[PDB]
Amino acid sequence: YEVPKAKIDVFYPKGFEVSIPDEEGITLFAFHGKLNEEMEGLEAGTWARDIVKAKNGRWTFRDRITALKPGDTLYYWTYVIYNGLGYREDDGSFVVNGYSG
């Protein structure tokens, strides 16, 4: 199984969203992230959230408070339970280059 690569949308003045599409057999998505500093292994990070449920065909993490700027880098890893087994998107990095809304 391959965890879908997370889609990251950054909002102005603040907030961001991290999501993946859902499919049969996924029962959890979790996001672990840090800003402008690498994750040290599979640590919890600054943001560590298990998304409660899929909604509208996606699993979505939403931050409403953090003001990201162009050139900021989000470092992250995600976890999915697929058919009862755990899998990750490892070594995620996203450089903010622009806003979605």
| Closer by beta carbon to Zn ion, 28 or else 96 | 28
Three-state DSSP at 70 gives coil
Is 37 one of the binding residues for Zn ion (CB under 5 A)?
no
Binding Zn ion (rule: CB under 5 A), the pick from 10, 18, 20, 30 is: 30
Calculate ∠ Cα 60-67-100, nearest 5°: 55
Strand order in the sheet with 73-82: 47-51, 26-35, 73-82, 85-95
Q: Which is nearer to Zn ion, 27 or 100 (CB)?
A: 27
43 binds Zn ion (CB under 5 A): yes
91 is a site residue for Zn ion (CB under 5 A): no
Query: Measured from the CB of residue 8, what is the shortest distance to Zn ion in angstroms?
Result: 18
